[model samples]
Each structure stands twice: as C-alpha cells, then as structure tokens.
Target chain A: LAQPIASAKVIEVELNDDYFNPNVITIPINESTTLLLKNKGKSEHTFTIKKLGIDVVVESGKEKNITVKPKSAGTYELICRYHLLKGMEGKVIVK
Target chain B: ASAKVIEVELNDDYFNPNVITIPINESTTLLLKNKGKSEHTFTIKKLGIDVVVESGKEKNITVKPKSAGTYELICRYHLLKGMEGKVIVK
Candidate 1:
C-alpha cells in the first residue's frame, strides 16, 4: 500500500568490491525510501550521492542505511567518494 | 556431523544465499538476520516451520530433517514478492 508519500520504500543497495548492484536506483519523490547499503567488499567505501548533498561511510563487510527524500525528479549522480578515480559511480533516479 | 551454522540474510523482498544444504536426521541451526525494514518469516510447510523475524533483528531456527529431500521456505507475508529459499538435506 503506497502511503501517500508518507511511508518509505525500502531498497537494498549492494556495495560490491568496486561497484554497486543495480548501479541505477529508482526512488520516488516525496516518499523517501531507505537505502540499505550493504558493503560486500574487502575495503571501506563511501556512498556519496552528489546531487543530494549526502554521504556516508560504509565499512567493508558491514552496512549503513540512509533515508533520503528526493527534492525533485532527476537522474542524480552517486559515487564512491574514495573510489571515484576508478569511476565507481551509480545513479539515483527519481520518479 | 559437526555442521556449521548456516547464515542467511533476510533482505528487502529477498534472502541472501537462498539455498542451503543440511544433513538428514541431524539438527541444523540457521542464523537468520532480518535486515529489511519490514517483518518477515521463514516458513516451511513440509517441515512445519513458520518462523517470524522482526526487522533489524536476528535469531536462530533449528530443525532436524528425518527425510532426505529439498524443502522450500518462504516468507508467508511476502511470498508473492518471492521471498523464498531451499533447504537441501542429504
């Protein structure tokens, strides 16, 4: 049941050794969803959703969850702050 | 048999390592962690197992399979979304 943008949509974000699973994530506007950032890697990494001005550190073999409500609809760039050189980036697309 | 504990992660609409193997006529323990935001269950009708696991919580469920067969497990509440697993006994 969609809670009229009140309830959240929980989505699993898999953080691999170098990239993200479902590299492109789709989220809804107004109704913020929770991102379960699962770090399935051997090294620590940061989840930086540049357009939203949000970032968090997720240790290797651990998890970090973030609740984000997009302000508008767009394909925002998300990347790993530390591994951006490797071009380990993803996208946050809002509907 | 000194069977190691089986670890399974219950995620949003899915389960990690959905399939596992256990020995017959022996008790096996599963360490299930519900990492999703909603509640879930590890239901196996054939084995008469209906395990309820709350969000962000972890617990264990032990079972002794007297028969050698593969049993299907599902989260009763989210079966339509396909939260299922298999326990293969040998």
Candidate 2:
C-alpha cells in the first residue's frame, strides 16, 4: 500500500503572544503533522511554516494548525511574524 | 548526546539572547537571574509552562529536549506589553 503524505502523523505546535511552546520538534518523513497554535498573550501572532509551503497567520483568541507530510528529510525554520526583529524564530527537523 | 548548558541573563529592562538555538534530543538548564530591583516571571504560554521567579532571586529548570521547534518565553508581571524570549531546539 502506498503511504499518504498528508495524513501520516499528527503534530500540534502551540503558541502564545511572544513565544511558541515545546518550540523545537523532529518528525519522520511522509507523516502528517498538525501545528496547533494558540495565542495566550495580549496581542496577536501568526505561525508560518516557511518550507512546507505553508503560511498561516492567526489572530488573538484563535488558533491555527496545519498538517504536512514531507517527501524529504531536512531542517525547517519557524518564526513568529510579530517579533521577527526580536529574533522570534526556531527550527523543525525532519528525519 | 552531550549535556547542553545554556545560561540566560534576565534583567528588568531586557532578556539576553531573546532567542536560543539547540539540537534535538538535548537537555537544557534555563537559569534565570533577576538583575533588576522589581519582580519578574518566565512564562512559556504555549506549552502550558509558566514560572514566577521574583527579583534578586535565581531560578533554574531542567528541560529535556525531544523536539525540534521554537517556543516563546516572557515576563508576565510587566505591563499590558509582554517582555518575551525565544527557546529554540534543533
């Protein structure tokens, strides 16, 4: 049976106003991952998956998540769009 | 995997290295030293993680790194504005 790239795993990435929780994580290829982003701070923020071809921006009081299946193994970057200058960024490893 | 020790200086006016980078499956000791006169806190809201370390006090936490991603840390005692930091694991 062929593996489905979009529904192989479930990964949830939570968020707050100025940071992300369990910020860095690694996953396997062809697995589906969901990024559960929550904004607990006073202001707004967005979670963007730069390499997975995903660009999602969520506002306050709301959360946005995504599921992606990687065809190759590599490292990806996650940045808080709100605090780019403040160095609000991290990495995601695919194995 | 080797022991990864990262030291962070916490001041009332700022947080050094607002962002950090590390490898996956690593263990880190986040040391918070209050160099300010007033109170401060370390809150990572997304992971349901929050710590209140008062002024003139030093606080340390042992975190086992099993994931490769980014998280946020901040001082909750501040004004409506958030004094924040970044925790990165590779």
Candidate 3:
C-alpha cells in the first residue's frame, strides 16, 4: 500500500462529531470528481452545498459515495446542515 | 380484524408510531420501511426478534405476542442515537 495510489480520481472526507477532516476540497473545473464521505462519529451528518445543489446524508460509522462536477470556477461553501450552527463548514475550490 | 398489518417508518434517529399495542397470542405483521439512507433494525430481546432493513427497502416481519406485558424495542445499530420504541401486549 505504497502512497495508496497517488493518482486519485476520488477524494475522501471524514465526518466527526463536530467537524470535517480536510474541510477544503480542490478540483479542476469542468471535471467530475468522486467523493467518499464517511461518518466516523456516533451521530448523523450531512454534506450540503447549496450553491451546487449537492446534498448527501451520511449515517454514523457509515460511508457514502458522491460524484461532483464543477461547471463554474469559484470557491463554493459546503456545510453540514445538521451541525451548521456548530460552525461545521468547509470550502470547495474549483479552478 | 383477522390479520393485522402495521406500517413503521424507520428514519435517521427515530421511528414512527413508536408505541405499538396488540393483543397477546396474536400474530402481527410489522411492515418496516426504511425511509432513511441508513440501515435500521427492529430488535427486541424479550421477543427474540432482530430484523434488519436496508436503506430504501421494506421488510415484513411476523411477531406473535405470547405474553401479556410490555417489551422494549430498539434499533441496535442506532441505539446510541436514541432510537427506541415499545411493544405493548394486552
């Protein structure tokens, strides 16, 4: 398992009790990127990007696969709807 | 009625109609529908029943209440999430 395949077409994000690991995601514009969202906490979490209309529900200790394509070049905001008030947010930069 | 069918909705952290009442010694069908994206379960140690329902799926479980009493029902997978219910046999 050397480097776990450096050339990655998929990005993984870990969900915890109050925050997301590697909250910032960078991807090329006009390209599709696969996201592996896993909830490692004991509660439910959601990854919602209102600007991109991407809403994903992930259960506790479970994982989900989501495909995202950036049609615009900008930095989008992503937040957990369940923990938004807890300041659970992230950024997705498409350039 | 001759046969009983009760529909239960399994959601993220709760269940619809958590309190279920039925006659003792009668067989009942619990139509469990997993409306959430996570896997849910219908577990009852007293009744010797543990059923699993995947996301967006339905499961028909038959249960016979042999004793006239109250039993606890919960989803073992999401037990920590505070998902619980009850079965009342009278």
Candidate 4:
C-alpha cells in the first residue's frame, strides 16, 4: 500500500459528476508531487494516467492519496475512465 | 413477500440497483439475474466471493460481512466500461 506523501506539497483534486476541478495541474519535474483525490459525487470514478501507470479508484465520498515523480518535463493527460467522454479530462503540466 | 433478498439485475454490462445497503454481521441473500446476452461475473475480491451468471440465468449469494465499509462489485468482462458498483455495509 502506498502511504500519503508527507513533507511535500500536496495538491487536492476534487472529482465531481462529470468533471475535475482545476482542469490544469502544474507539477515540478523530477520532483515528487502528492495528489490528494476526493470524490464528491454519488458515483465511483477512476483517475487514470496511462503514461504514469496510475489508475486509482476514488469511491463516492472517499479520498485517495497518491504520490508521483514525473521524470521529465512534458504534458500528460489525466482522465476519468467512467466519464471520459463526458468532459472528465485534465492536463498535467510538468515544468 | 419477496422482500428479504436483494434483487439485482445484470444487463448490458451494468447492474441494476448498482448500489446496495445491508446490515453488517448478518447473513444477507443476494439474488442476481443476468439479463445480458453474454456471461458476467459478479466479483468481490475482499469477500472471497464470485458468481458467474449466464444469460437469462440467476444465482444466489449469501454474505455475512464482518465489518462496516464500502465494497466494490465488478463484472470481470466489463471493468473498463465502468461496470462496477458498491455494497455498503451499515
């Protein structure tokens, strides 16, 4: 089990019915960024990023903590598998 | 009356009454009927329970959850399609 990232900057992302708040997230390349995912909707949602091999489930009214270390400065996609076509997409910009 | 069982219908990669609530520490009977054209499995890894229902067939599952929490129920063939649900133990 992965523990919550402590002593690092944490970014909280709220997952709603059909979208993610702050569709654009900025992170520092080569550094660890802690992602706190909260699902506020009444349905289950999956936060998936294929390039990073992240497919975490955020159950309704639940939260998940994940830490990622982007190895390069590039743009990545963050999507919700349950509602990808319903406008549940975001961008991760690593600088 | 047919009120003691939690009746669920599996159809086209989804489950009717997807979210269910039951009391913890009590034996609960689940009546799952597959209405889809293909076979589907109702799987819950935590409870060591899996049920494969063929089209037009039904299966019964009895569970006594020891704790109160949310459990996931998924169809093995359609996980990517969001063919999943929850069982809430109260």
| Leading candidate by DockQ | 3
Name the top TM-score candidate: 4
Residue lDDT tens for model 4, A19-65: 89878999999888899999887666778888878899887789999
Candidate 3 stretches with Cα past 4 Å from truth are A1-40, A43-95
lDDT of 2 by residue, B35-70 (tens): 765455677766556776655778887676676779
Better by TM-score, candidate 4 or 2:
4
Q: Is candidate 2 or candidate 3 better by lDDT?
A: 3
Q: Which runs of model 1 end up more than 4 angstroms from their true locations?
A: A1-95
Model 1 C-alpha RMSD vs. true structure (Å) is 13.1
After superposition on all C-alphas, the RMSD of every candidate to the true structure, in Å, is 13.1, 17.3, 7.8, 10.0
- lDDT: worst 10-residue window of model 1 chain A: A1-10
Q: lDDT of model 2 at residue A61?
A: 64
How do the residues B1-90 of candidate 3 rate in per-residue lDDT, one tens digit apiece?
A: 446598889887688989988778878888999887566788889999999787778999888879998899998756777889988988
Error of 3 at A54 (Å): 29
Q: How would you encode candidate 1's per-residue C-alpha lDDT over B37-70 as one tens digit per residue?
A: 6566788899898887877889998989899999
lDDT value for candidate 4? 0.83
- How should the candidates be ordered by DockQ, best one leading? 3, 4, 2, 1
Better of 1 and 4 by DockQ: 4
Model 4 chain A: ten consecutive residues of lowest lDDT: A1-10
Model 2 chain A: weakest 10-residue lDDT segment is: A80-89
Better of 1 and 4 by lDDT: 4
- Ranked by lDDT, top first: 3, 4, 1, 2
lDDT of 4 by residue, B1-90 (tens): 224999999986798989998888888899999887656678887877788887788999998889898999888656766889998988
